[PDB]
Nucleic acid binder design. Sequence first.
DNA 1: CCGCAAGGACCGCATACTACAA
Length: 319
Amino acid sequence: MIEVTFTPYDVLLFRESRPFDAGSESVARSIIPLPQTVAGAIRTLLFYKGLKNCVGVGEEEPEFTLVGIAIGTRIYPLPFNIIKSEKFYKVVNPGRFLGKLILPPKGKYKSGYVTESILEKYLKGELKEVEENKVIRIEKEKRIGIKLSREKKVVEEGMLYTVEFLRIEKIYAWIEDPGCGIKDILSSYEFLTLGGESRVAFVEVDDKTPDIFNRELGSTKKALFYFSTPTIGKVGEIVQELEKRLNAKIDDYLLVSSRPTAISGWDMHEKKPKGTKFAIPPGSVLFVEFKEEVEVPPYIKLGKLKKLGYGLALGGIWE
DNA sequence: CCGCAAGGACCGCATACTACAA
Ligand SMILES: [Mg+2]
């Protein structure tokens, strides 16, 4: 597995799906980067390097597989079963009622990010709570710009716009290369355009598997699956897929989640927006009670568009 | 020829203290 590290020179824009044309709708608000955007940046580099075989021009997916992405300062969205109570974010474990897994009422969820070490303790079921100071928020930087007339140096009519950028220190991407020679091509490049407004990020590439993908969790009936990237597909099909890949049937499951992630994007091949897809948002947790004990995998890919970085679930246990 | 050999008042007050288009 190859590990790509993107270091933004300054700011990044991963624009939400909304009109953003000069002289009209003029507000661009960034979201947390979707893995397909990172995949697109890599595919575009290969598209220009002449490796159009691995790109998948006009195709939904490339030949290579983007395992997933993570932002860094490496941090992850607070699991949705972690609820803020006073100055602490408390882990809420599944309960049972009428023979069904439920999450007991303990307050509303508040968004935020935690370090990889805090997530690791969570996945091992050893995390009780997190002090509110260790819960990170992503910094935004709002910039307001204009367009000037060529000669008179005054603002052209209606040419004012606003961008809410993200201030991100690092983005990590992991790629499985079936022999396209991506590691060599990425090594030849120092930087690439990532997201909107022609912002660039420095590129480093190392041949390594992150330790979080190599954890030994043991065997249990009570496994959980933390989605680190958006996961596309019906919950039923995802659970069924999970049953097949682990060769074990499920007694019951509970999806703790939030607002669905709206995913469209821009088709650079056809020069028009991509079709809207809906996904289980990062930070969502699928609690599963298998009928038999399973060896909980450190990570597992689920749902549609796996090669674009979607459906990266991190294994964990609960009691 | 000798001696003395500064002191307090005031102590920045007021007004203006964004306007407008692109
Ligand atoms: Mg632009």
